[PDB]
Design a protein around this ligand. Structure first.
Ligand SMILES: *C(=O)[C@@H]([C@@H]1NC(C(=O)O)=C(S[C@@H]2CN[C@H](CNS(N)(=O)=O)C2)[C@@H]1C)[C@@H](C)O
Length: 239
């Protein structure tokens, strides 16, 4: 019954999507197009999570430094403010993560993306846009696995840096559950891709990772990603 209900949540907003859930070493898929789970998409802003891990691990940034807004118009007004890396994570402020990517540099970025085995691990030659328009791609299954490992601090990085990136991703504590999440919207690719990748830590300690992936269309508000995710997690008894 739960799976049917989640399928219809996607039908109700008139697009196709999948929600991958990971608990322990096994995954389940829900939604109205389950085949999306094993299909590659650009990560868009969801790459910020790995960008931050690499930057912190290799001492290219700190968690307390402030990226000051220089007063120049940004793509979105939400980005026109002083930000730490964590603030920029929450706002998905691309210019901050492009700055970070340039600090890391192509050689180190390529080595680390390959070491961690992220998606197709192909970053090409352009260090500041490879996660937006290709060539880097990743499946929702892979995003859920990545989130699960970050949640358990089992990515191949220091525990300190994984703890720091977790803190950047914290959304809220709701009914005792701690919710961590990163959204993404690849709007200038066709078709458009929407992401919400994260995890829940339940009061008893259990970790449940998720990755929502759907086709974004004109007339579908971006708030659908969080709404469908939370409702689905509630249906599953995860929230
Ligand atoms: C990353 O994918 C991309 C980000 N991602 C998102 C997103 O919604 O996931 C946006 S949308 C942009 C940022 N937040 C603004 C909405 N205001 S609100 N509701 O207060 O959050 C608009 C943007 C495309 C990077 C690469 O640009």
């Amino acid at each position: 019954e739960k799976a049917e209900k989640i399928k219809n949540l996607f039908n109700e907003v008139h697009t196709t999507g999948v929600l991958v859930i990971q608990q322990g070493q096994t995954q389940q898929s829900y939604g109205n197009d389950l085949a999306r789970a094993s299909t590659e998409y650009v990560p868009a802003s969801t790459f910020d999570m790995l960008n931050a891990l690499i930057g912190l691990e290799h001492h290219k940034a700190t968690t307390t430094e402030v990226f000051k807004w220089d007063g120049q118009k940004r793509l979105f007004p939400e980005w026109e403010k002083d930000m730490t890396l964590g603030d920029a994570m929450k706002a998905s402020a691309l210019p901050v993560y492009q700055d970070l990517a340039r600090r890391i540099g192509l050689e180190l970025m390529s080595k680390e993306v390959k070491r961690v085995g992220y998606g197709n691990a192909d970053i090409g030659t352009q260090v500041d846009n490879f996660w937006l328009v290709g060539p880097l791609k990743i499946t929702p299954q892979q995003e859920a696995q990545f989130a699960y490992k970050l949640a358990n601090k089992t990515l191949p990085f220091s525990p300190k840096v994984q703890d720091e990136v977790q803190s950047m991703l914290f959304i809220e504590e709701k009914n005792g559950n701690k919710i961590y999440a990163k959204s993404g919207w690849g709007w200038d690719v066709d078709p458009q891709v929407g992401w919400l990748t994260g995890w829940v830590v339940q009061p008893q300690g259990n970790i449940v990772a998720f990755s929502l992936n759907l086709e974004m269309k004109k007339g579908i508000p971006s708030s659908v990603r969080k709404e469908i995710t939370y409702k689905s997690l509630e249906q599953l008894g995860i929230l």
